[PDB]
């Protein structure tokens, strides 16, 4: 019904190996060559990656800033309003970023701010300027 398990035999394979007196030797050598060709390619990338790794040696340890946790507040101080306005100018819609920048205002509080002060801080006009960047 079918070839014994693990034995591989297609119509296509057979015809190629039997087409002429040394078709097999040709097929096998052409594969030895493809095989050697791909291990050169491995050695090369292994060497490429060894160099790249040694460039990242030390990682980003000297660049970490021990980050503070601090709780929320639903009150807007003048300081915070101005921070937000500038944050919107830099980051646009990105509520998460704006929240992070202000530090003490959740995402929702920020989203609300957008509506409540839309008029007073010409928020639409500011946003169109973020869009030109």
């Amino acid at each position: 019904r079918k070839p014994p398990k693990g034995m591989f035999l297609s119509q296509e394979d057979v015809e190629a190996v039997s087409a002429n007196a040394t078709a097999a030797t040709t097929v096998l050598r052409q594969l030895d060559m493809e095989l050697v060709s791909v291990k050169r390619q491995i050695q090369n990338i292994k060497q490429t990656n060894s160099a790249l790794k040694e460039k990242l040696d030390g990682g980003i340890e000297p660049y970490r800033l021990p980050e503070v946790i601090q709780k929320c507040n639903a009150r807007w101080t003048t300081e915070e309003q101005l921070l937000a306005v500038q944050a919107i100018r830099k980051y646009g819609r990105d509520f998460q970023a704006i929240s992070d920048v202000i530090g003490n205002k959740s995402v929702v509080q920020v989203k609300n701010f957008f509506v409540n002060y839309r008029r007073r801080f010409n928020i639409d006009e500011v946003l169109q300027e973020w869009e030109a960047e």
């Binding site: 079918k2 070839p3 014994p4 693990g6 034995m7 591989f8 035999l9 119509q11 394979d13 057979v14 190996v17 039997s18 097999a24 097929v27 096998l28 594969l31 030895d32 493809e34 095989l35 791909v38 291990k39 390619q41 491995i42 990338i45 292994k46 490429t48 990656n49 790249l52 790794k53 460039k55 990242l56 990682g59 980003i60 000297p62 660049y63 970490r64 800033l65 980050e67 300081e79 101005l82 921070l83 500038q86 944050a87 830099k90 970023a97 992070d100 920048v101 202000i102 530090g103």
Partner: protein, 666 residues
């Protein structure tokens, strides 16, 4: 199988169905009601049972009838018909059995039988029993032909046929009850020793054997599923097919290696893209940190844009550090995924050169069984006879197989040292010209009604001919002769005066160094209570070794054995014999095989008798006059002793039917 069904099975007959042969003789019955057919079958099976139960004595019609219960004994004609039918076709009353009815004093018809090997002897006994005058012409100074034993004192070793391949359905089972052959089973345990003389661990042995079987199964797939049976208008050989299969497995090993290393490169590449991102990201982070410091060093108080700058840069820096930690997480995953692949390469080769040598031992073994190199066997038909194999264990004749022909020859008229040179067959009769082997000038002429030719296929192939047929045989026959294969294989008998090997080890192998020499003394048998070792020469080695002197052959044997049992151990042999079946002018090989370009049908063609043309123009179609038997003439059991025996039984029945006429076909 048991009872009356056991009898059918033991006679190679279907118990519940009538054969083609039976149809021809009992057309009235096979074309009639099912019930009648069942009556016939029972009578047939029962008659066979009575004979098989006691084959040391002639089973007569009267004896048969007396042991059938009603209503089966209520048709005496039918019983008599069945009896004569079985008797004529050799299914009962064959071999050597004490007869009840003495032989007809006046004989009818004259037959010359060429050759006194088992086919010839079996046919002669039958013809004599049927009342014909029979003479056998044998070239050798002995009977039995390719069944040749060797004797010295109590030491006994077969140079020809040696194995009884299972008793279930084998006619030799009947012969073994008639003649006192001492049959002995063959332990299938067979350790192997590599060329260096060290034993093969039974880890490898099993693995390689399994692969060998898998490869055979593979060639069968190539043959039946892909119809790979013709290559460049030439028939494909088993050898060729195996080479293709092996090459494809080697190809697959390389295909897997490639895909494995390609998965490594592909991953290696993802890594380098990620590392590049990381390096660039580290630069950005390093730069932002510097800016964030410059910003944080503007001491307060500070206007809101300055404050915004510090807070803003801080956020951007943390965000980027989060990106870097994610990429570092991915780096550890890819790095480990590589240590995994680097540690798990796919297998290195299809076969280690050691593996290939052991594999070649198995091929040599197959070359020995078929008495020919694998490159000569038909891929499509080499195993055409496998479905007819007998059941039970293989056995050897402890007291020498020659006991069979020697016994079968008792009471027959055999002319030894008489080599047939020419066979003339005409409308009116035949004449056979033969010479005395011991002085060729002495000539003999034998006239007969019919000639039964059991000359070996090897002899029939001889060019120029050893035996001339006048008129020449027709092309349909000669072409069959040219197409079929006739192999070769040899034995080396080593007699010592003391044992030095393991006496419970029945047989063991020597693994050759190269493929070319795989059949050279690859197997050794330790078969008797006596201290004798038999070495086998198979495949391409068989033919070549025949050109080498005994001393050089024996030297090689001793060299091998010294390597296995120790140089100190193995003493010099007391006596040695080397067979050379190819050079033997009366055999010219060992036995037939289905060569590429041939088929089983050729075996049938070898069997078909020849009928000469009319002597007088316008005269009626003659009788057939030239008949053939032999190992090479029986499609289902070729190349064996039982095959030869059956061929003789067949021709005896056909000849007797032709010249004495059937009683039993009304």
């Amino acid at each position: 199988p048991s009872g009356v069904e056991g009898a059918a099975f033991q006679s190679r007959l279907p118990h519940d169905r009538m054969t083609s042969q039976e149809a021809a003789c009992f057309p009235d019955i096979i074309s009639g009601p099912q019930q009648t057919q069942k009556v016939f079958l029972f009578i047939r099976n029962r008659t066979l049972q009575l004979w098989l139960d006691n084959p040391k004595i002639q089973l007569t019609f009267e004896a048969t009838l007396q042991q059938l219960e009603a209503p089966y004994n209520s048709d005496t004609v039918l019983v008599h018909r069945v009896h004569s039918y079985l008797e004529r076709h050799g299914l009962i009353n064959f071999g050597i059995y004490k007869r009840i009815k003495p032989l007809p004093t006046k004989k009818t018809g004259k037959v010359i039988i060429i050759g006194s090997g088992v086919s010839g002897l079996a046919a002669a006994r039958q013809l004599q029993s049927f009342g014909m005058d029979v003479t056998l012409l044998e070239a050798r100074d002995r009977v039995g032909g390719r069944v040749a034993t060797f004797r010295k004192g109590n030491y006994v070793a077969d140079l020809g046929a040696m194995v009884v391949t299972g008793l279930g359905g084998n006619p030799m089972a009947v012969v073994s009850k008639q003649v006192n052959m001492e049959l002995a089973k063959i332990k299938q345990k067979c350790p192997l020793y590599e060329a260096n003389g060290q034993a093969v661990p039974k880890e490898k042995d099993e693995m390689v054997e399994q692969e060998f079987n898998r490869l055979l199964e593979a060639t069968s797939y190539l043959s039946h599923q892909l119809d790979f049976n013709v290559l460049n208008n030439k028939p494909v050989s088993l050898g060729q097919a195996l080479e293709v299969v092996i090459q494809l497995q080697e190809k697959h090993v390389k295909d897997e290696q490639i895909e494995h290393w390609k998965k490594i490169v592909k991953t290696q590449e993802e890594l380098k893209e990620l590392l590049n991102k990381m390096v660039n990201l580290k630069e950005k982070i390093k730069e932002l940190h510097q800016q964030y410091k410059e910003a944080s060093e503007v001491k307060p108080p500070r206007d809101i844009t300055a404050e915004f700058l510090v807070k803003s840069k801080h956020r951007d820096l943390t965000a980027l550090c989060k990106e870097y930690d994610e990429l570092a997480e991915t780096q550890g995953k890819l790095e480990e995924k590589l240590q995994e692949l680097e540690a798990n390469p796919p297998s290195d080769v299809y076969l280690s050169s050691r593996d290939r040598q052991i594999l070649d031992w198995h091929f040599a073994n197959l070359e020995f069984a078929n008495a020919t190199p694998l490159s000569t066997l038909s891929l499509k038909h080499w195993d055409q006879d496998d479905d007819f194999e007998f059941t039970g264990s293989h056995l050897t004749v402890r007291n020498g197989y020659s006991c069979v022909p020697v016994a079968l020859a008792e009471g027959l008229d055999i002319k030894l040292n008489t080599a047939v040179r020419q066979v003339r067959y005409t409308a009116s009769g035949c004449e056979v010209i033969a010479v005395n082997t011991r002085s060729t000038s002495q000539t003999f002429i034998y006239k007969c009604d019919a000639v039964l030719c059991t000359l070996p296929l090897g002899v029939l192939k001889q060019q120029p001919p050893a035996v001339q047929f006048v008129p020449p045989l027709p092309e349909w026959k000669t072409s069959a002769v040219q197409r079929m294969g006739f192999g070769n294989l040899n034995k080396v008998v080593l007699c010592f005066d003391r044992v030095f090997w393991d006496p419970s080890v029945n047989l063991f192998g020597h693994v050759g160094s190269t493929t070319a020499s795989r059949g050279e003394l690859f197997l050794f048998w330790n078969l008797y209570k006596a201290p004798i070792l038999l070495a086998l020469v198979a495949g391409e080695a068989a033919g070549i070794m025949e050109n080498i002197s005994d001393d050089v052959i024996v030297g090689r044997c001793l060299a091998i054995l010294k390597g296995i049992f120790g140089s100190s151990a193995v003493p010099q042999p007391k006596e040695t014999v080397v067979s050379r079946w190819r050079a033997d002018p009366w055999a010219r090989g060992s036995y037939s095989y289905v060569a590429a370009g041939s088929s089983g049908n050729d075996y049938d063609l070898m069997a078909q008798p020849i009928t000469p043309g009319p002597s007088i123009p316008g005269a009626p179609q003659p009788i057939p006059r030239l008949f053939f038997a032999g190992e090479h003439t029986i499609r289902n059991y070729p190349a064996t002793v039982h095959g030869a025996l059956l061929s003789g039984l067949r021709e005896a029945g056909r000849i007797a039917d032709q010249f004495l006429g059937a009683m039993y076909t009304l």
